[PDB]
């Protein structure tokens, strides 16, 4: 025979976990896609000597595109 | 020695009620009605 199993209400914990996952992913999947696309199609800067008479901008002293931005 | 008639009678009544309660815990053939 199959008997009823008495448990506490699991509806609310499951709902909270689903909501948290949804919102975290909703903002974090576009961020991951953007990071991957930037890395693939806009790589990191290459270290080079300062040409004579040139005064670089401050953001030009960093190599990652997101850090530079 | 043994149960007094009051104790025996209370035991029979509680046993009947408990057996009914345990029988009621059984699942009918459709109890897990899964939604789509
Ligand atoms: C689930 C939710 C529930 C709740 C949980 C709580 C969640 C809380 C979250 C809170 C928010 C957190 C946000 C934090 C922000 C941090 C982001 C960051 O800084 O990224 C860092 C880092 C990126 O660093 P970077 O500075 O941007 O890169 C610098 C370079 O310019 C880049 O180098 P590149 O030029 O080579 O380009 C690489 C490029 C491209 O690389 C490649 O394509 C190559 C890969 C290999 C492929 C080669 C073979 C495969 C293909 C072959 C077949 C096809 C070809 C041939 C075709 C025919 C087929 C035969 O890929 C990338 O760009 C990196 C991936 C981007 C990931 C960014 C992460 C953002 C997450 C933010 C959202 C947070 C929520 C999570 C949701 C996210 C979605 C799930 O991202 C990583 O995590 C990398 C980790 C992977 C490395 C390998 C792992 C090594 C393991 C060693 C340890 C071993 C011990 C065992 C443990 C292992 C377990 C892992």
DSSP single-letter state for residue B25: T
Query: Ligand 1: which residue has its CA nearest to atom 4?
Result: A21
- A64 touches A44 (CB < 8 A): yes
Beta strands in chain B (DSSP E): none
Write phi, then psi, for B26 (nearest 5 degrees): -70, 150
Contacts 24+ apart (CB under 8 A), B28-31: B31/A2, B31/A4
Resolution (A): 2.5
Alpha-carbon span A44 to A67, nearest angstrom: 10
In the block, residue with structure tokens 């009051």: B6
- Following CA atoms B23, B25, B29, B34 in sequence, which dihedral angle do they give, to the nearest 10 degrees? 170
- DSSP 3-state helix, strand, coil percentages of chain B (rounded to 5)? 55, 5, 40
In the block, residue with structure tokens 């057996």: B19
Residues of B in contact with A4 (CB under 8 A): 25-27, 31
Tell me which residues of chain A have a C-beta less than 8 Å from any C-beta of chain B: 1-4
Alpha-carbon span A60 to A54, nearest angstrom: 12
- A1 touches B26 (CB < 8 A): yes
In the block, residue with structure tokens 């025979």: A1
Alpha-carbon span A58 to A46, nearest angstrom: 16
Alpha-carbon span A44 to A62, nearest angstrom: 9
């Amino acid at each position: 025979k199959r008997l009823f199993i008495i448990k506490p209400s699991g509806f609310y914990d499951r709902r909270f976990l689903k909501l948290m996952r949804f919102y975290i992913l909703l903002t974090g999947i576009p961020v991951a896609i953007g990071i991957t696309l930037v890395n693939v199609f806009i790589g990191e800067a290459e270290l080079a000597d300062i040409p004579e008479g040139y005064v670089p901008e401050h953001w030009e002293y960093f190599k990652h595109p997101i850090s530079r931005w | 020695s043994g149960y007094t008639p009051d104790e025996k009678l209370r035991l029979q009544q509680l046993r009947e009620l408990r057996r009914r309660w345990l029988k009621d815990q059984e699942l009918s053939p459709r109890e897990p009605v899964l939604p789509p």
